[PDB]
Symmetry: C2
Subunit: 66 residues, 2 copies
């Protein structure tokens, strides 16, 4: 479903969990938790992740049938 | 936060709450529930909502500093 493949993008740019999380102003554990199973980020926060991370939602959040 | 002011966009094109929800493959209850206050949509689903709705997430989910 969500897949939360943000980390792949993060490692893609060699991104650290701390930096974008710093950019997001949210806990690093949460951000690196989301890729695992942590409650999905709020839509604007997702926009922020995309906007600050500089990547479209689709790439960071994989598209699935569901 | 999210605001979920999708409704306004949905009314804006005279979109049926039912129709996109069907496109999304989710209940109107949920889709029209989210705009009211129901749990925020799955991020991937959100992509789909904008995708079927044909409008950016930000329009439906406006930006709030937090």
């Amino acid at each position: 479903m969500i897949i939360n493949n943000l980390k792949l993008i993060r490692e893609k740019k060699k991104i650290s969990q701390s930096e974008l999380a710093a950019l997001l102003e949210v806990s690093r554990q949460t951000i690196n938790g989301i890729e695992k199973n942590k409650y999905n980020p709020s839509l604007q926060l997702a926009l922020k992740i995309a906007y600050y991370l500089n990547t479209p939602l689709e790439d960071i959040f994989q598209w699935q049938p569901e």
